[PDB]
Amino acid sequence: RPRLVWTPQLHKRFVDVVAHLGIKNAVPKTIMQLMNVEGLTRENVASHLQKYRLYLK
DNA sequence: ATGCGTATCT
DNA sequence: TAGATACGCA
């Protein structure tokens, strides 16, 4: 129920999955499927990817 | 029906 | 600042 905390370990797995897939295929559902984290939703990944893209600009 | 991207909210 | 929610539109 409490908001998801993106721990350095969880963010690292996100970064590795986003690096594995290219920019084209690094979409929230494919990231989530590859990350393989229990209880992690498409919306959790989508929100994180938005902030990640803003940080890379 | 599904899910991505942007804006907006807490 | 980070993470959640809303929604337009592919």
Side-chain angles (χ1 to χ4, degrees), chain A residues 13-14 16-22 25-37 40 45:
Chain A
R13 197 165 274 190
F14 168 88
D16 292 336
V17 165
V18 170
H20 181 268
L21 302 158
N25 291 340
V27 293
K29 200 200 176 68
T30 320
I31 300 156
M32 181 199 73
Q33 291 178 154
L34 265 78
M35 283 187 71
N36 201 50
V37 181
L40 189 72
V45 174

